[PDB]
Model the fold of this input.
Amino acid sequence: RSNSSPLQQMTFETSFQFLKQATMLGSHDELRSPSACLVVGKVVRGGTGLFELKQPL
Amino acid sequence: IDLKFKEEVNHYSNEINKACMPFGLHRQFPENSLQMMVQSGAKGSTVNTMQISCLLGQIELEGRRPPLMASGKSLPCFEPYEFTPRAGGFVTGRFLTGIKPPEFFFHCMAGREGLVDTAVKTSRSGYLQRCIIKHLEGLVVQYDLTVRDSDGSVVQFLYGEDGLDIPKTQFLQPKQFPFLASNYEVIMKSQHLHEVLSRADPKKALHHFRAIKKWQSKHPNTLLRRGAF
Amino acid sequence: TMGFPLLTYQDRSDNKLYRLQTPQSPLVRPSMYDYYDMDNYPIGTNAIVAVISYTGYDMEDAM
Amino acid sequence: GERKTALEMVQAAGTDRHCVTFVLHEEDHTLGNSLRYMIMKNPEVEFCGYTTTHPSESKINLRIQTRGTLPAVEPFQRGLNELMNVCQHVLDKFEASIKDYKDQKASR
Amino acid sequence: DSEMDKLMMDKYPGIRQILEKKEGLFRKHMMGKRVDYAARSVICPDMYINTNEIGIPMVFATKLTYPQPVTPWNVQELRQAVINGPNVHPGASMVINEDGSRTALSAVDMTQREAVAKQLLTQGTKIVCRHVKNGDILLLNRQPTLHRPSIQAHRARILPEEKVLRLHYANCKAYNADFDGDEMNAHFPQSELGRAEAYVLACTDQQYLVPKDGQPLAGLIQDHMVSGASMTTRGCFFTREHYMELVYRGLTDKVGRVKLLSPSILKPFPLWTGKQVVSTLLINIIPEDHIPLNLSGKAKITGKAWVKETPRSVPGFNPDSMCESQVIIREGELLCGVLDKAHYGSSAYGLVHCCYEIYGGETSGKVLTCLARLFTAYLQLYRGFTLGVEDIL
Amino acid sequence: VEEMRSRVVLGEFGVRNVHTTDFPGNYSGYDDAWDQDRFEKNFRVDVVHMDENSLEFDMVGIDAAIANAFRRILLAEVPTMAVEKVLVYNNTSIVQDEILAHRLGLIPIHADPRLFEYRNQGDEEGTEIDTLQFRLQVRCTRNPHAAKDSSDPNELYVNHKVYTRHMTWIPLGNQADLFPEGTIRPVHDDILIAQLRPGQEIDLLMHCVKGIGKDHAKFSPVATASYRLLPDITLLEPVEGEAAEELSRCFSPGVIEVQEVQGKKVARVANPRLDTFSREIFRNEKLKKVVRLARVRDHYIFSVESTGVLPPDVLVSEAIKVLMGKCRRFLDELDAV
Amino acid sequence: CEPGEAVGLLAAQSIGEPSTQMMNVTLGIPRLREILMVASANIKT
Amino acid sequence: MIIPVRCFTCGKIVGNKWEAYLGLLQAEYTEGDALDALGLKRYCCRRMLLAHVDLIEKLLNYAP
Amino acid sequence: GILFEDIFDVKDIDPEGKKFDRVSRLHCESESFKMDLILDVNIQIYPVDLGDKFRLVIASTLYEDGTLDDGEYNPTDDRPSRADQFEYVMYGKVYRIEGDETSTEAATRLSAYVSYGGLLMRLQGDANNLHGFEVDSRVYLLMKKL
Amino acid sequence: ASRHGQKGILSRLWPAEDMPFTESGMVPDILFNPHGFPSRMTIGMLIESMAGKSAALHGLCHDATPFIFSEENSALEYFGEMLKAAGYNFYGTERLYSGISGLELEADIFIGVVYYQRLRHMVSDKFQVRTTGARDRVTNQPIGGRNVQGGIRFGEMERDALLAHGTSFLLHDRLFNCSDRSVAHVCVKCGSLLSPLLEKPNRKYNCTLCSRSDTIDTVSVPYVFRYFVAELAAMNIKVKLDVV
RNA sequence: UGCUGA
DNA sequence: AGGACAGCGTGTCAGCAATA
Ligand SMILES: [Mg+2]
Ligand SMILES: [Zn+2]
Ligand SMILES: [Zn+2]
Done:
């Protein structure tokens, strides 16, 4: 409950209570957890994905 | 009573294992094939080697001897409230010369509780691990060596309280320096090389440790309430 | 075990039915195996087994 | 004749003629082991060893490392010849013995 | 919510049940999707493929396809693959066009595949969906995945006529595989950016140490421990021809001369020691430029296991100064010690753990492979291991 | 300072060594460079038994590598003829079609494989050069001339049991000449192929091709071709006085012949070759110290038993020639560069 | 400890694997669940 | 079902000693003496006949 | 090229009780030097008994004419004057030299440990005559009974 | 499997000329590693081998009834006497040769006759490979089973190990590209997946909620992500997503 | 839902 | 404010038949 990720926290347990909460509070998700990053099809923010590559022109 | 009974029986087994297993075997360790398989770590144990020869042991189901019936007998073959250790699951037979029917029964009880416990234990462990993994998953080491969560909350300011991930700290223990010293030429050529050793400048950290050492020299008892006044 | 399940093929129309071609009767078997004739329906074959570590492919439960 | 059921030679690092690895195809431990026994009798070879590369495949690798002078392809071609000479002698001796025994038994 | 109302019937599950449970939609189809380009089959012991390799049985290899782009430096080998066809092994099932897509070669007329072997290099280049090509990287997983070492990357050694995926026995304890019917999954990266990570990060030699306590995970098992303990014992003497053919059969060396040793006994008959076989196998594996390692430790077999007869008091002798319990490798040459599980095994600070520290994880894998082969040749050629009834008696 | 040049000594808890000390540099003076004349002088073959389908020559004075090469040639490289394809026109038997084909492949044919040749890859048809065809066509009928009896041969029997006698050779090409009438036939006329009941029929054509016992056992020409090193038994002490008989019972019975030199009984080692290694003296605890049993170094004993396709001596000759052919193939491929 | 290590997942799996596989106090997974998963003020012993 | 044609370990042909074996057992001979009189020396062959169960005689009893 | 030569006599055939198969550990003791020798010897090739003498030599070369050894084994060598007055020749390396324990005493005795593949030897005695040794040094152990 | 719980897959078919032949000419047909005994203590297999070898030798048939052989009358004594009465050795070990080197192995091997059963589980019934195939319509994911192409559920336990290695891209490639990778459109200004619209046949997307047609742009997303936006709307809940 | 495999 | 209590929870891993 003391967690800043609605997409996490609903991939764990009691997903409908945590969805009702996140919905009646307008709770915003930053897509920084591994779960929130695998739900919307992003690259996790640890290990190999932690930096850019920035090909110079 | 159960506990103070699995004791006279255990005195006789010690006397029984010692009689046969070390030197009562027909062939000894260099030339025995069972020893030299449990003794070199290939497969098995001295308690498997025994329990194949000279004793099977005291059966224990829930940490206790086999349960009694509602009339006070542990098995239809045994009088009610029979004192012999045999009636309580003390198997003196070995797999070399098989075990009798009553001992077979207790051994099956034990072997079956083992499987039941395996199933239930795994059922609980899976859930424990799922919960743990679902909470500590976003903690990664950052480029400032601090262990932060997904939202930036600093959990630790240094991973192990010193950094130093586990697999690499195996030879940094003492008692492994006489190895790094013996293999110094290979270690410098193969990894660090003369290049890194001379591209190192230790003054800032070395002076800090000198200051710490001087302080600890002037204050042997570091719990003595230092103060100006 | 794949064995000899019955004598009446052409008649059963089951779903699966595993049959072993040339079963044998154990040369070492309990006497009760002979009270309920279980050789009307054999289950395996006798093999010459050597207990030896020779190949490098028979370790950890493989044969 | 056969481009690969037979010999493929891999000269070592630096193509050392004195260290060669012959690949013999369609061969198992029979020829491998007899030829290694016949090549070990040459005092001019310092290391001879054969090995099967993998069970699924049908091929062996001989490794001959000779001394400083000879190109390690003479030891191979001489072990072959000595093994074939031994086989010819064994064949002659065995046929003569069989004939002699047949006569001794048919007479009596 | 199917169960908000308990007094109605003909009630099929609502959305709370479509989303929220182990069946659910998050713990399934969200975190546990099903994957393409993956195989699953029973695993079999190999031992004659290097520790970093998996054996693929030519039925996955002909179906698993990697979609590689056509460029000036590969258009030759890709051309052979499109010519070999969908069913011959170094072949290809399809070729994707620059703007169009999916012109399948699976025909077996052998002429249209040649009609399309041209026009390769004839925007985004044509991509040939080639088969697995004996050097590819594959992720292998056993299903109770309880640690990081349960998924490791392997190097696609293709084997003909089988339906089993063959894996070295050093990689057993990592997976907990037991060769008693042990299905295992093999995933085929398809991006060329997950291949770089399977090579660098998920590789199976970066996985030598368990992350729980840093102690080694890969090691030899069973009869590679009873073989090495009975060869490295003090009274094992080998003639020149059993010394050789035991060194070369552990090495199978492909690059460079095999550097040998001198007989320990030179006179009544030249004879070697078995510790010398392991020595000479150790000085060939260690990389040419690097120098052999020094190592001092203890053996698993206690120095008391050998005491047949009561020990008598020697006035000036510390029995442990010269015992088979102390392992002493001095410049890559084993001088004392049995080298049981304490080395070659899953125990820390042994010979292979120090090899992995000083010279890297590929050299420790090489040492494991070569030592397995040597200890197999020994039991298969000159000695034998069995377990009768006169050793349990 | 004690040399033992000729025997593989042995106790109970294991054998002493695995060497033979007859190679280059294996001694101070006893060095070797493969003296061919020394071989041709120390080699001798002695043929003990030679019934038909048996041979037991000795092959004294050869290494284990060459003996093993000969043994592995007989088991897996000497060529034989055997059924490879089966065309089944009808088969109303209890025995399946695939099982019948299998059973037919394992039947030995008396054609000599040296007059034939290997079918080229994809040569489905075959020709007089590489194939032999045989036909089994049998039908079971009740015999009209039978009483109310139950012996299966008397009634319910024209062809109750299908044997190898029922297989007939169909001369494929000009093979009727070259092969006289009885020469190409199955080796055994009594092998039970199947069993039939009235109204049941077998009808098939079998094709026999050449091949070696290496790609399938059906093509293998010997039951077994193993060898064993000649045992050696030495009485370190004169055994006598009713311990001689206990000694004579701890061995295969012919090995220790108990003579009666004086009033007392002396045991003597009459024939060491009969001994089977059973190591039953080592259980005696008083005579394990009296006898030393080992093996002669390079003195073998072979035993070849053919199935019936070729005689055993011809089998051994063709094995030696197959090894020579391997060597010559590799010599001539080396000369190709 | 290279930057990006994701050490929390390693801690999770290192506490999990040993338990999943494997006197007047509590032992085993009961105690681990009392400590980690429940954080109870009431413990059995 | 029916007698194997060749012994599995060796390859010796035992498919022609079934009826002879049955005939020597009807004459009063033990299974040991019978297997000896047929030439089955090594026990790998002796197990091939000693433990054979002829189930072709029980399948050949249901209607055509 | 000799580093040590002496005439020993076997005192104990295997005191520790560890018994290997073809190897026997002799505990000898020099004469006229009172040096000590522990020696693992392959007794299947070279039987040794109690109360037996033997002349023992340690060398760094077998040529006894100065030329160093090349570290390569040729059974085909054409220089055949290498020491052959000796029945049992070994070849190992010294892996440990340790001055004796006694402090406050002269105690200038050294124990040199040599390994011969797997057959260890220990030579203990006055340092004055064990100077030729040094760790990692290859040495031949020639022996000849008397 | 044997009659004593000693199961095991068939790993090799060893050539008949590479098998260790015995001094009697025989050659085993099953090779059983001797390391299954020490931890499993199936001493009944070691007695069945000797009993069956004695049976095959003497033409007998011994019984293996439990509780018929005591400590005083042992089974090993009985069957070793039977063997020694046939010319073999008490302890049941006959010495073999190496079929590969041709030398008599130093150890004498324990050989005998045991009764093997063949189990009903074959690799031919338990092997699966899926590439592409029935994509489940509700989630656009591989179908499963073995009868169709049948995919392998990845699972929540496995993604955790793949990210421990820090191989984010392998975990990205696998899930997104081998599973539901879709290419949806969003009202970038209003952040709704549901809003973008296609004209009946140019087919330029136009937002239904706000009439702007040039705001719409594509975003890579899964189908179960779209399925979840649909399910959440089936309740009046709104998922407003911020496009960048 | 009854089975089965690790 | 001492309770009484009603209320949610999870639960390793893949196959087959078959049938709602
Ligand atoms: Mg298993
Ligand atoms: Zn046989
Ligand atoms: Zn809008």
